[PDB]
Structure formats: C-alpha cells, structure tokens
Amino acid sequence: QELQQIHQYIMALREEYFDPSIVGWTVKYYELEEKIVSLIKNLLVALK
DSSP: OHHHHHHHHHHHHHSSSOOOOOOOHHHHHHHHHHHHHHHHHHHHHHHO
C-alpha cells in the first residue's frame, strides 16, 4: 500500500514547485511511473 503514497508524492512534486512547458508531456511520464509502480506492487502481492 505505501507504494501508491510514494508514487503520488513523487508525481505531485512535478507541478507543485515547477511549471512544465506543457502539461500533456507530464501525464505520459506519470503513466510510465504507474507502470513501474504496478510492477513493484505486483511483486509485493506475489510474495504473500
């Protein structure tokens, strides 16, 4: 469960203190981050 909190914290920083040139370019990065977070969470679930 803590992985989602960490992922949300990381994603929010991209906009909290920065103003990226175009917003649409951030969402692709967020999707890739979600891919990786899903991988890690899948491993964690499989352990049990």
